[PDB]
PDB file of C-alpha atoms in Angstrom:
ATOM      1  CA  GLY D   1     114.422   1.464  56.838  1.00 24.04           C
ATOM      2  CA  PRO D   2     117.283  -0.610  58.464  1.00 21.27           C
ATOM      3  CA  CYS D   3     120.250   0.893  56.767  1.00 20.44           C
ATOM      4  CA  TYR D   4     118.936   4.590  56.587  1.00 21.90           C
ATOM      5  CA  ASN D   5     121.790   7.142  58.021  1.00 21.33           C
ATOM      6  CA  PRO D   6     118.951   9.924  58.958  1.00 22.44           C
ATOM      7  CA  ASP D   7     121.732  12.645  59.204  1.00 19.85           C
ATOM      8  CA  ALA D   8     122.982  11.425  55.356  1.00 20.46           C
ATOM      9  CA  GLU D   9     119.447  12.232  54.425  1.00 17.56           C
ATOM     10  CA  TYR D  10     118.653  15.371  56.415  1.00 15.01           C
ATOM     11  CA  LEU D  11     120.191  18.440  54.763  1.00 16.79           C
ATOM     12  CA  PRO D  12     122.029  20.194  57.544  1.00 17.46           C
ATOM     13  CA  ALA D  13     119.650  23.486  58.336  1.00 19.85           C
ATOM     14  CA  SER D  14     120.985  26.948  58.829  1.00 21.03           C
ATOM     15  CA  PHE D  15     119.283  30.258  57.601  1.00 20.32           C
ATOM     16  CA  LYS D  16     121.117  33.811  56.349  1.00 19.26           C
ATOM     17  CA  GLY D  17     124.327  31.695  55.849  1.00 20.61           C
ATOM     18  CA  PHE D  18     124.583  30.693  59.954  1.00 20.58           C
ATOM     19  CA  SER D  19     124.313  26.962  60.435  1.00 20.98           C
ATOM     20  CA  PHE D  20     122.500  25.454  63.370  1.00 17.19           C
ATOM     21  CA  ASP D  21     120.986  21.748  63.822  1.00 16.15           C
ATOM     22  CA  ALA D  22     117.394  21.455  64.111  1.00 12.77           C
ATOM     23  CA  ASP D  23     115.368  19.432  65.957  1.00  9.69           C
ATOM     24  CA  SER D  24     112.140  19.458  64.319  1.00 11.27           C
ATOM     25  CA  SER D  25     110.887  20.488  60.459  1.00  8.52           C
ATOM     26  CA  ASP D  26     107.167  21.300  59.011  1.00  8.37           C
ATOM     27  CA  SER D  27     105.434  22.856  56.222  1.00  8.49           C
ATOM     28  CA  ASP D  28     101.629  24.724  55.465  1.00  9.22           C
ATOM     29  CA  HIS D  29     101.060  24.041  52.077  1.00  9.80           C
ATOM     30  CA  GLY D  30      97.891  24.634  50.641  1.00  9.93           C
ATOM     31  CA  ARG D  31      95.540  25.635  47.840  1.00  8.54           C
ATOM     32  CA  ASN D  32      93.171  28.533  48.753  1.00 10.00           C
ATOM     33  CA  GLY D  33      88.982  28.846  47.363  1.00 13.61           C
ATOM     34  CA  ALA D  34      85.785  29.805  47.874  1.00 12.91           C
ATOM     35  CA  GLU D  35      83.067  27.690  48.882  1.00 13.70           C
ATOM     36  CA  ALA D  36      79.490  28.164  47.814  1.00 11.56           C
ATOM     37  CA  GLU D  37      76.407  27.125  49.289  1.00 12.78           C
ATOM     38  CA  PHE D  38      73.572  28.807  47.721  1.00 15.02           C
ATOM     39  CA  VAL D  39      70.290  28.490  49.640  1.00 13.57           C
ATOM     40  CA  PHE D  40      67.552  25.707  49.585  1.00 14.78           C
ATOM     41  CA  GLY D  41      69.345  24.104  46.811  1.00 14.04           C
ATOM     42  CA  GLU D  42      71.172  20.739  46.880  1.00 17.84           C
ATOM     43  CA  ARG D  43      73.952  22.106  45.210  1.00 18.28           C
ATOM     44  CA  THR D  44      77.554  23.598  46.256  1.00 16.68           C
ATOM     45  CA  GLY D  45      80.332  25.698  43.623  1.00 15.87           C
ATOM     46  CA  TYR D  46      84.274  26.145  45.028  1.00 18.44           C
ATOM     47  CA  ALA D  47      86.383  28.342  43.239  1.00 19.12           C
ATOM     48  CA  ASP D  48      90.166  28.293  42.927  1.00 20.19           C
ATOM     49  CA  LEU D  49      91.509  31.621  44.420  1.00 21.32           C
ATOM     50  CA  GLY D  50      95.089  31.402  44.148  1.00 22.60           C
ATOM     51  CA  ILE D  51      98.464  29.868  46.496  1.00 22.31           C
ATOM     52  CA  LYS D  52      98.221  30.034  50.600  1.00 21.86           C
ATOM     53  CA  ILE D  53     101.451  31.564  51.445  1.00 23.66           C
ATOM     54  CA  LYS D  54     103.780  28.299  52.798  1.00 23.59           C
ATOM     55  CA  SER D  55     105.544  28.584  55.896  1.00 22.87           C
ATOM     56  CA  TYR D  56     107.865  26.545  58.459  1.00 25.58           C
ATOM     57  CA  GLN D  57     108.218  25.907  61.304  1.00 27.58           C
ATOM     58  CA  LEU D  58     112.010  24.066  62.885  1.00 24.27           C
ATOM     59  CA  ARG D  59     113.096  23.528  66.444  1.00 21.90           C
ATOM     60  CA  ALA D  60     117.249  24.324  66.975  1.00 25.47           C
ATOM     61  CA  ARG D  61     119.312  22.920  69.921  1.00 25.64           C
ATOM     62  CA  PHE D  62     122.405  24.133  71.374  1.00 20.43           C
ATOM     63  CA  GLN D  63     123.770  21.596  73.894  1.00 21.81           C
ATOM     64  CA  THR D  64     127.261  22.173  74.142  1.00 19.27           C
ATOM     65  CA  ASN D  65     130.246  24.355  76.265  1.00 18.75           C
ATOM     66  CA  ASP D  66     128.875  27.289  74.977  1.00 22.20           C
ATOM     67  CA  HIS D  67     126.314  26.649  73.939  1.00 21.10           C
ATOM     68  CA  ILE D  68     125.198  30.556  75.429  1.00 21.75           C
ATOM     69  CA  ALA D  69     127.228  32.290  73.027  1.00 18.94           C
ATOM     70  CA  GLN D  70     126.148  29.777  69.995  1.00 18.01           C
ATOM     71  CA  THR D  71     122.168  31.135  70.968  1.00 19.59           C
ATOM     72  CA  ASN D  72     123.182  34.972  71.570  1.00 18.11           C
ATOM     73  CA  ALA D  73     125.156  35.061  67.512  1.00 17.93           C
ATOM     74  CA  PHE D  74     122.359  33.053  66.126  1.00 15.64           C
ATOM     75  CA  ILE D  75     119.406  35.787  68.124  1.00 16.73           C
ATOM     76  CA  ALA D  76     121.730  38.302  66.279  1.00 15.20           C
ATOM     77  CA  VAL D  77     121.912  36.902  63.119  1.00 14.97           C
ATOM     78  CA  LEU D  78     117.607  35.934  62.694  1.00 16.68           C
ATOM     79  CA  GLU D  79     116.892  39.894  64.468  1.00 13.15           C
ATOM     80  CA  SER D  80     118.866  40.645  60.738  1.00 15.12           C
ATOM     81  CA  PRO D  81     116.644  43.121  58.473  1.00 16.45           C
ATOM     82  CA  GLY D  82     115.632  41.997  55.479  1.00 15.34           C
ATOM     83  CA  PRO D  83     114.216  38.001  54.439  1.00 15.18           C
ATOM     84  CA  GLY D  84     117.224  35.862  53.842  1.00 14.77           C
ATOM     85  CA  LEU D  85     118.230  32.157  52.410  1.00 14.89           C
ATOM     86  CA  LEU D  86     117.248  29.073  54.576  1.00 14.24           C
ATOM     87  CA  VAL D  87     118.109  25.526  54.319  1.00 15.92           C
ATOM     88  CA  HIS D  88     115.000  23.010  55.772  1.00 14.39           C
ATOM     89  CA  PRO D  89     116.474  20.167  56.599  1.00 15.41           C
ATOM     90  CA  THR D  90     113.433  18.022  54.100  1.00 17.15           C
ATOM     91  CA  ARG D  91     113.328  20.826  51.396  1.00 16.77           C
ATOM     92  CA  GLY D  92     115.970  22.357  50.785  1.00 15.52           C
ATOM     93  CA  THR D  93     116.539  26.250  50.028  1.00 16.74           C
ATOM     94  CA  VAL D  94     114.219  28.741  49.941  1.00 17.20           C
ATOM     95  CA  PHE D  95     113.982  32.070  50.284  1.00 18.22           C
ATOM     96  CA  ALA D  96     112.398  32.844  54.646  1.00 17.21           C
ATOM     97  CA  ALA D  97     111.545  35.592  56.608  1.00 14.29           C
ATOM     98  CA  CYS D  98     112.052  34.553  60.215  1.00 14.73           C
ATOM     99  CA  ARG D  99     108.858  35.524  62.307  1.00 16.80           C
ATOM    100  CA  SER D 100     109.596  34.654  65.994  1.00 20.31           C
ATOM    101  CA  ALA D 101     112.001  32.869  67.900  1.00 18.52           C
ATOM    102  CA  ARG D 102     111.098  31.461  71.478  1.00 18.07           C
ATOM    103  CA  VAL D 103     114.423  30.826  73.095  1.00 19.30           C
ATOM    104  CA  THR D 104     113.778  28.347  76.166  1.00 19.41           C
ATOM    105  CA  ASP D 105     116.758  27.937  78.627  1.00 19.51           C
ATOM    106  CA  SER D 106     116.872  27.427  82.050  1.00 19.66           C
ATOM    107  CA  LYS D 107     119.004  26.479  84.887  1.00 17.73           C
ATOM    108  CA  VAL D 108     117.516  25.195  88.058  1.00 16.86           C
ATOM    109  CA  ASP D 109     115.755  22.489  86.317  1.00 18.49           C
ATOM    110  CA  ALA D 110     117.971  21.771  82.473  1.00 17.03           C
ATOM    111  CA  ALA D 111     120.987  23.475  82.606  1.00 18.08           C
ATOM    112  CA  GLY D 112     123.388  23.223  79.127  1.00 16.38           C
ATOM    113  CA  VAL D 113     121.049  23.043  76.871  1.00 17.52           C
ATOM    114  CA  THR D 114     118.903  25.798  74.832  1.00 20.71           C
ATOM    115  CA  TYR D 115     116.110  25.669  72.413  1.00 22.62           C
ATOM    116  CA  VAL D 116     114.439  28.213  70.250  1.00 26.71           C
ATOM    117  CA  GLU D 117     111.229  27.550  68.456  1.00 26.70           C
ATOM    118  CA  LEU D 118     111.655  29.041  65.520  1.00 26.26           C
ATOM    119  CA  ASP D 119     108.560  30.538  62.677  1.00 25.25           C
ATOM    120  CA  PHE D 120     109.494  31.407  59.142  1.00 24.13           C
ATOM    121  CA  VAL D 121     107.640  32.660  55.940  1.00 26.53           C
ATOM    122  CA  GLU D 122     108.362  32.052  52.247  1.00 27.90           C
ATOM    123  CA  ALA D 123     109.098  35.730  51.484  1.00 28.28           C
ATOM    124  CA  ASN D 124     108.965  36.052  47.892  1.00 25.23           C
ATOM    125  CA  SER D 125     111.182  39.449  46.611  1.00 25.24           C
ATOM    126  CA  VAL D 126     108.530  41.951  44.817  1.00 25.73           C
ATOM    127  CA  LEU D 127     109.980  45.018  42.396  1.00 25.98           C
ATOM    128  CA  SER D 128     109.305  48.297  44.076  1.00 24.51           C
ATOM    129  CA  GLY D 129     106.390  50.488  42.105  1.00 24.92           C
ATOM    130  CA  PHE D 130     103.813  48.369  41.107  1.00 24.47           C
ATOM    131  CA  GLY D 131     104.743  45.786  39.994  1.00 23.93           C
TER     132      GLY D 131
ATOM    133  CA  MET A   1      52.941  36.632  83.622  1.00 20.85           C
ATOM    134  CA  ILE A   2      55.916  39.063  82.205  1.00 18.60           C
ATOM    135  CA  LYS A   3      54.020  39.133  78.441  1.00 19.16           C
ATOM    136  CA  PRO A   4      53.916  42.971  77.311  1.00 18.44           C
ATOM    137  CA  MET A   5      52.681  42.705  73.810  1.00 18.54           C
ATOM    138  CA  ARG A   6      49.814  40.803  71.275  1.00 21.05           C
ATOM    139  CA  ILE A   7      50.345  42.179  67.882  1.00 21.99           C
ATOM    140  CA  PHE A   8      47.370  42.308  65.592  1.00 19.96           C
ATOM    141  CA  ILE A   9      48.355  42.877  62.075  1.00 19.43           C
ATOM    142  CA  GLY A  10      44.667  42.973  61.840  1.00 20.82           C
ATOM    143  CA  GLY A  11      43.825  40.186  63.954  1.00 19.17           C
ATOM    144  CA  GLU A  12      46.422  37.815  63.303  1.00 19.19           C
ATOM    145  CA  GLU A  13      48.170  37.904  67.410  1.00 17.87           C
ATOM    146  CA  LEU A  14      51.847  37.911  66.097  1.00 19.55           C
ATOM    147  CA  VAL A  15      53.128  34.824  68.097  1.00 17.03           C
ATOM    148  CA  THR A  16      56.493  34.119  65.847  1.00 15.26           C
ATOM    149  CA  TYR A  17      58.021  37.982  66.833  1.00 17.91           C
ATOM    150  CA  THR A  18      61.947  37.170  67.091  1.00 19.55           C
ATOM    151  CA  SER A  19      62.009  40.732  68.336  1.00 21.73           C
ATOM    152  CA  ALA A  20      60.746  44.340  68.855  1.00 20.25           C
ATOM    153  CA  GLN A  21      61.362  47.743  69.465  1.00 23.62           C
ATOM    154  CA  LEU A  22      59.115  50.050  69.566  1.00 26.41           C
ATOM    155  CA  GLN A  23      59.452  54.378  69.810  1.00 23.30           C
ATOM    156  CA  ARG A  24      57.383  56.652  70.809  1.00 25.11           C
ATOM    157  CA  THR A  25      58.917  60.948  70.825  1.00 22.34           C
ATOM    158  CA  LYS A  26      57.634  63.927  71.766  1.00 23.28           C
ATOM    159  CA  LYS A  27      60.576  65.701  68.949  1.00 26.92           C
ATOM    160  CA  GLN A  28      58.941  64.324  65.841  1.00 27.13           C
ATOM    161  CA  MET A  29      55.190  63.606  64.568  1.00 23.23           C
ATOM    162  CA  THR A  30      54.909  59.635  64.123  1.00 24.99           C
ATOM    163  CA  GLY A  31      56.744  56.542  65.654  1.00 24.90           C
ATOM    164  CA  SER A  32      58.580  53.258  65.182  1.00 23.79           C
ATOM    165  CA  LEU A  33      57.506  49.467  64.956  1.00 24.86           C
ATOM    166  CA  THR A  34      60.121  47.439  64.324  1.00 25.60           C
ATOM    167  CA  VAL A  35      58.622  43.837  64.207  1.00 26.44           C
ATOM    168  CA  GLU A  36      60.865  40.550  63.023  1.00 24.44           C
ATOM    169  CA  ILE A  37      58.932  37.499  61.489  1.00 21.75           C
ATOM    170  CA  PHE A  38      60.727  34.050  61.143  1.00 21.31           C
ATOM    171  CA  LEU A  39      58.657  33.206  57.537  1.00 19.77           C
ATOM    172  CA  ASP A  40      59.725  29.301  56.987  1.00 22.36           C
ATOM    173  CA  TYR A  41      60.366  28.376  53.270  1.00 20.44           C
ATOM    174  CA  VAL A  42      60.194  24.606  52.300  1.00 19.28           C
ATOM    175  CA  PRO A  43      61.037  24.475  48.467  1.00 19.35           C
ATOM    176  CA  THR A  44      58.709  21.318  47.351  1.00 19.45           C
ATOM    177  CA  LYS A  45      55.316  22.056  49.450  1.00 19.14           C
ATOM    178  CA  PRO A  46      53.160  25.545  48.519  1.00 16.76           C
ATOM    179  CA  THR A  47      54.193  28.605  50.362  1.00 17.22           C
ATOM    180  CA  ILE A  48      52.367  32.022  50.707  1.00 15.49           C
ATOM    181  CA  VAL A  49      53.200  35.499  51.081  1.00 16.32           C
ATOM    182  CA  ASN A  50      51.947  38.391  52.401  1.00 15.36           C
ATOM    183  CA  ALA A  51      52.188  42.191  50.746  1.00 13.16           C
ATOM    184  CA  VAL A  52      50.909  44.446  52.860  1.00 11.36           C
ATOM    185  CA  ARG A  53      53.147  47.567  52.644  1.00  8.79           C
ATOM    186  CA  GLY A  54      50.012  48.835  53.861  1.00  4.27           C
ATOM    187  CA  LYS A  55      47.491  46.705  55.904  1.00  6.13           C
ATOM    188  CA  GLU A  56      47.509  48.319  59.725  1.00  5.42           C
ATOM    189  CA  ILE A  57      49.054  47.114  62.941  1.00  7.62           C
ATOM    190  CA  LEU A  58      48.801  47.985  66.612  1.00  4.48           C
ATOM    191  CA  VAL A  59      51.523  46.996  69.692  1.00  3.92           C
ATOM    192  CA  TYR A  60      48.962  46.378  72.901  1.00  2.42           C
ATOM    193  CA  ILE A  61      52.320  47.156  75.506  1.00  4.17           C
ATOM    194  CA  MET A  62      51.615  45.158  78.596  1.00  2.00           C
ATOM    195  CA  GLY A  63      47.478  44.608  78.208  1.00  2.00           C
ATOM    196  CA  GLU A  64      47.476  48.263  76.753  1.00  2.00           C
ATOM    197  CA  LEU A  65      47.346  49.957  74.341  1.00  2.00           C
ATOM    198  CA  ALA A  66      51.137  51.402  72.966  1.00  2.00           C
ATOM    199  CA  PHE A  67      51.090  52.061  69.661  1.00  2.00           C
ATOM    200  CA  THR A  68      48.801  52.504  66.604  1.00  4.28           C
ATOM    201  CA  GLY A  69      49.237  53.085  63.032  1.00  3.84           C
ATOM    202  CA  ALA A  70      53.200  47.301  58.059  1.00  6.58           C
ATOM    203  CA  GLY A  71      52.813  50.484  56.762  1.00 10.10           C
ATOM    204  CA  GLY A  72      55.882  51.161  56.751  1.00  9.29           C
ATOM    205  CA  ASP A  73      57.618  48.398  54.383  1.00 11.68           C
ATOM    206  CA  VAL A  74      58.852  44.936  53.787  1.00 11.32           C
ATOM    207  CA  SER A  75      62.221  43.220  54.251  1.00 12.05           C
ATOM    208  CA  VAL A  76      62.560  39.976  53.435  1.00 14.99           C
ATOM    209  CA  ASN A  77      66.005  38.950  53.684  1.00 12.92           C
ATOM    210  CA  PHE A  78      68.086  36.213  53.663  1.00 14.33           C
ATOM    211  CA  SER A  79      71.252  34.364  53.906  1.00 13.54           C
ATOM    212  CA  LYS A  80      72.639  31.083  54.529  1.00 18.26           C
ATOM    213  CA  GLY A  81      72.746  29.698  57.786  1.00 19.71           C
ATOM    214  CA  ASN A  82      70.391  32.267  59.681  1.00 14.95           C
ATOM    215  CA  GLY A  83      68.351  33.216  56.761  1.00 15.64           C
ATOM    216  CA  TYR A  84      64.830  33.641  55.778  1.00 14.47           C
ATOM    217  CA  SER A  85      63.760  36.330  58.299  1.00 11.81           C
ATOM    218  CA  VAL A  86      61.338  39.488  57.863  1.00 13.45           C
ATOM    219  CA  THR A  87      61.984  42.710  59.220  1.00 11.52           C
ATOM    220  CA  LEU A  88      58.268  44.631  59.241  1.00 14.56           C
ATOM    221  CA  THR A  89      57.933  48.501  59.775  1.00 17.46           C
ATOM    222  CA  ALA A  90      55.160  50.526  61.179  1.00 18.78           C
ATOM    223  CA  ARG A  91      55.395  54.962  61.403  1.00 18.02           C
ATOM    224  CA  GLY A  92      52.239  56.178  64.051  1.00 19.78           C
ATOM    225  CA  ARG A  93      48.677  56.752  61.625  1.00 19.24           C
ATOM    226  CA  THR A  94      49.645  59.921  61.243  1.00 18.44           C
ATOM    227  CA  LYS A  95      52.090  59.492  58.551  1.00 19.30           C
ATOM    228  CA  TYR A  96      50.777  60.368  55.209  1.00 19.37           C
ATOM    229  CA  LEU A  97      50.656  64.465  56.882  1.00 17.07           C
ATOM    230  CA  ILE A  98      54.677  63.315  56.448  1.00 17.01           C
ATOM    231  CA  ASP A  99      55.191  61.854  52.875  1.00 17.17           C
ATOM    232  CA  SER A 100      52.041  63.404  51.199  1.00 17.96           C
ATOM    233  CA  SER A 101      52.102  67.181  49.596  1.00 15.43           C
ATOM    234  CA  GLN A 102      48.702  69.673  50.097  1.00 13.60           C
ATOM    235  CA  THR A 103      46.416  69.512  47.339  1.00 14.18           C
ATOM    236  CA  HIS A 104      44.245  72.411  49.013  1.00 13.45           C
ATOM    237  CA  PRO A 105      42.545  74.013  46.138  1.00 13.19           C
ATOM    238  CA  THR A 106      42.423  77.981  47.300  1.00 16.44           C
ATOM    239  CA  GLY A 107      45.781  77.981  49.012  1.00 16.09           C
ATOM    240  CA  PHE A 108      45.122  81.141  50.597  1.00 13.15           C
ATOM    241  CA  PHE A 109      43.685  80.974  54.275  1.00 12.49           C
ATOM    242  CA  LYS A 110      41.753  84.556  54.650  1.00 13.69           C
ATOM    243  CA  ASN A 111      40.513  85.663  58.390  1.00 12.83           C
ATOM    244  CA  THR A 112      41.361  82.331  59.938  1.00 13.73           C
ATOM    245  CA  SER A 113      42.843  80.575  63.207  1.00 15.26           C
ATOM    246  CA  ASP A 114      46.053  78.251  63.368  1.00 16.78           C
ATOM    247  CA  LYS A 115      43.740  75.315  64.172  1.00 21.29           C
ATOM    248  CA  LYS A 116      41.348  75.995  61.479  1.00 18.75           C
ATOM    249  CA  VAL A 117      44.410  76.127  59.234  1.00 18.12           C
ATOM    250  CA  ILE A 118      45.610  72.433  60.557  1.00 18.40           C
ATOM    251  CA  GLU A 119      42.032  71.101  60.546  1.00 14.79           C
ATOM    252  CA  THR A 120      42.026  71.856  57.009  1.00 16.34           C
ATOM    253  CA  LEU A 121      45.107  70.114  56.195  1.00 14.37           C
ATOM    254  CA  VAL A 122      44.714  67.134  58.301  1.00 13.62           C
ATOM    255  CA  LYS A 123      40.581  65.913  57.153  1.00 12.95           C
ATOM    256  CA  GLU A 124      42.125  64.902  53.268  1.00 12.86           C
ATOM    257  CA  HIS A 125      43.653  62.009  55.277  1.00 15.10           C
ATOM    258  CA  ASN A 126      40.634  60.962  58.371  1.00 17.40           C
ATOM    259  CA  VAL A 127      43.508  62.026  61.158  1.00 22.89           C
ATOM    260  CA  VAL A 128      41.630  63.376  63.681  1.00 21.68           C
ATOM    261  CA  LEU A 129      42.870  66.155  65.720  1.00 21.19           C
ATOM    262  CA  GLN A 130      42.992  66.455  69.451  1.00 21.96           C
ATOM    263  CA  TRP A 131      43.513  69.987  70.269  1.00 21.78           C
ATOM    264  CA  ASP A 132      44.426  70.664  73.861  1.00 24.78           C
ATOM    265  CA  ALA A 133      46.301  73.778  73.140  1.00 23.23           C
ATOM    266  CA  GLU A 134      44.006  76.835  71.816  1.00 26.63           C
ATOM    267  CA  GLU A 135      42.886  79.011  69.359  1.00 22.35           C
ATOM    268  CA  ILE A 136      45.626  81.926  67.758  1.00 20.85           C
ATOM    269  CA  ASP A 137      43.764  83.989  64.747  1.00 24.45           C
ATOM    270  CA  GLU A 138      45.794  84.482  62.227  1.00 24.86           C
ATOM    271  CA  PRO A 139      45.471  87.113  58.934  1.00 28.37           C
ATOM    272  CA  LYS A 140      46.807  86.038  56.317  1.00 25.68           C
ATOM    273  CA  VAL A 141      47.851  81.972  56.027  1.00 24.64           C
ATOM    274  CA  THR A 142      49.459  81.451  52.207  1.00 24.74           C
ATOM    275  CA  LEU A 143      50.691  78.054  52.099  1.00 24.83           C
ATOM    276  CA  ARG A 144      53.904  76.927  50.028  1.00 22.48           C
ATOM    277  CA  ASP A 145      52.502  75.449  46.852  1.00 23.12           C
ATOM    278  CA  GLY A 146      53.004  71.488  47.740  1.00 20.78           C
ATOM    279  CA  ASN A 147      55.189  71.973  50.950  1.00 20.91           C
ATOM    280  CA  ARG A 148      54.463  68.872  52.725  1.00 19.00           C
ATOM    281  CA  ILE A 149      51.630  68.575  55.325  1.00 16.39           C
ATOM    282  CA  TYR A 150      53.828  67.904  58.157  1.00 13.86           C
ATOM    283  CA  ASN A 151      56.391  71.246  57.231  1.00 12.67           C
ATOM    284  CA  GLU A 152      53.714  73.415  57.337  1.00  8.84           C
ATOM    285  CA  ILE A 153      51.757  72.138  60.416  1.00  7.84           C
ATOM    286  CA  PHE A 154      54.961  72.482  62.569  1.00  8.05           C
ATOM    287  CA  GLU A 155      55.853  76.066  61.122  1.00 10.88           C
ATOM    288  CA  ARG A 156      52.417  76.630  62.070  1.00 10.18           C
ATOM    289  CA  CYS A 157      52.240  75.448  65.832  1.00 11.46           C
ATOM    290  CA  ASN A 158      56.041  76.488  66.304  1.00 14.27           C
ATOM    291  CA  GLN A 159      55.046  80.275  66.011  1.00 15.06           C
ATOM    292  CA  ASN A 160      52.748  79.305  68.691  1.00 13.72           C
ATOM    293  CA  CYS A 161      54.485  76.813  71.479  1.00 12.25           C
ATOM    294  CA  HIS A 162      52.361  73.780  70.719  1.00 11.88           C
ATOM    295  CA  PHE A 163      54.063  70.623  71.088  1.00 10.10           C
ATOM    296  CA  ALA A 164      52.808  68.514  67.637  1.00  9.47           C
ATOM    297  CA  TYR A 165      52.968  64.530  68.256  1.00 10.01           C
ATOM    298  CA  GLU A 166      50.692  61.461  68.527  1.00 12.02           C
ATOM    299  CA  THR A 167      48.650  59.891  70.843  1.00 10.52           C
ATOM    300  CA  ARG A 168      48.512  55.381  71.680  1.00 11.27           C
ATOM    301  CA  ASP A 169      44.943  55.662  70.299  1.00 12.15           C
ATOM    302  CA  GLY A 170      45.712  57.035  66.501  1.00 12.34           C
ATOM    303  CA  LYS A 171      45.321  60.601  66.924  1.00 14.55           C
ATOM    304  CA  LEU A 172      47.255  63.713  66.533  1.00 13.05           C
ATOM    305  CA  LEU A 173      47.510  65.468  69.503  1.00 14.84           C
ATOM    306  CA  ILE A 174      48.636  69.557  69.395  1.00 15.36           C
ATOM    307  CA  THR A 175      49.562  70.237  72.796  1.00 14.62           C
ATOM    308  CA  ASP A 176      50.998  73.223  74.994  1.00 15.41           C
ATOM    309  CA  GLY A 177      51.770  71.400  77.728  1.00 17.92           C
ATOM    310  CA  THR A 178      52.038  68.326  80.015  1.00 19.00           C
ATOM    311  CA  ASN A 179      49.905  65.097  79.502  1.00 17.48           C
ATOM    312  CA  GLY A 180      49.782  65.003  83.975  1.00 15.84           C
ATOM    313  CA  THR A 181      49.871  61.665  84.876  1.00 19.60           C
ATOM    314  CA  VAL A 182      52.387  61.791  86.926  1.00 16.78           C
ATOM    315  CA  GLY A 183      54.207  57.939  87.620  1.00 15.23           C
ATOM    316  CA  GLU A 184      56.633  55.624  89.984  1.00 16.39           C
ATOM    317  CA  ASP A 185      59.848  57.519  90.993  1.00 17.80           C
ATOM    318  CA  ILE A 186      63.014  56.460  89.770  1.00 19.50           C
ATOM    319  CA  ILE A 187      65.413  56.339  92.197  1.00 17.15           C
ATOM    320  CA  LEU A 188      69.589  55.497  91.733  1.00 15.40           C
ATOM    321  CA  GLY A 189      69.513  51.529  93.210  1.00 13.79           C
ATOM    322  CA  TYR A 190      65.811  51.009  92.763  1.00 14.88           C
ATOM    323  CA  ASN A 191      64.495  50.609  89.240  1.00 14.19           C
ATOM    324  CA  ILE A 192      67.887  52.296  86.709  1.00  9.73           C
ATOM    325  CA  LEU A 193      69.583  50.017  84.880  1.00 10.22           C
ATOM    326  CA  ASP A 194      71.823  52.455  82.724  1.00 11.87           C
ATOM    327  CA  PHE A 195      71.796  56.360  83.305  1.00  9.09           C
ATOM    328  CA  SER A 196      73.437  59.362  81.344  1.00 11.24           C
TER     329      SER A 196
END
C-alpha cells in the first residue's frame, strides 16, 4: 500500500524477555503423510500422519556504539536452559527454543554492525511420565 | 573376450544374469551358485513363469566348467522403483546327501570298509563317488536311525583323515591329499587387489 506504516504493523521481536530488532522472519509449516505407489498400478494413495513441527528463522541486527555488549547479553540469554517465549514479528507470541545462533562480526570490512542468524523451533511443553 | 560365464539351466544360455556369485570350498560338501535375473512384467500382455525348484544347472567359467548342480530356490522379489528381480540359488549335486535321511534297510554293516559304507550311503541318490584315498577296514558300522546322509559320511571320513567335497563335474571327491595341478605365483605388487 501507499501509506503502510511498517513498524506500526510488525511486532517488535523479543525472545525470553530480551528485546531486539529483527531483519527477517520465516516459518516452516507443513503436513506430513505417507505416499502409496502400488506396483503395476495406475493409482496412488496418501495417508495423513500428523503435524509437521514448526520452525522459525530470524536475522537480528545490532548497529549501535555498544553493539558488542548487546550481542554478548543476547548470547548469554540465548544459551539459557529450557525453551522460552518468543515474539515472532509476524506470528505473535509462541514458545520456542533456540537451536543455532551464528554471530557474524567483521572489523576491517564492516565495523560497527553485528549480525545474528537465529534458528528457533516450536517447543511445546510436555507432562513428564508417559503423558 | 573377457567373457567368463555361460550358464545353462538345461540349455538356456543365460544372457540376462545381472550378477552372479559362485563359491567352492573344501570345508564343506557343496557349493553355492546365486544368479540374478530380470524378469519383466507387462500387466496387459501374457506372461510366463518358470517354477523350476529343481531343473539343474552349470556354470562354465571362462570357457571351462566351474560348477555343476536352480535347485536351491526361487526368490522373486518386488518393489516400486527397482523391483522385478529373481534371485536363483543352486547348491551342488551332492546335496540330497546333505538334506536327506538315510533309508538303508539293515542299519548294521558288518565286516565292511569305510569306502563301502560310503558307496551304499550315496548310491541311493545317484551320486558317483570319486574315491581316491584308500581302503580302511572296520568291523561294526551302525548308522544312527535316519541321521543324515552327510553327517554319517563326515563322521566316517574324519576318524580316518579324508577330505570330503565336490568336484566341477558333479561328483563326490573323497581324497586324502591334494589335487596337484600347481599354478600362478601370486606376488604382492603383481596381481593381489587385496590381502588379509
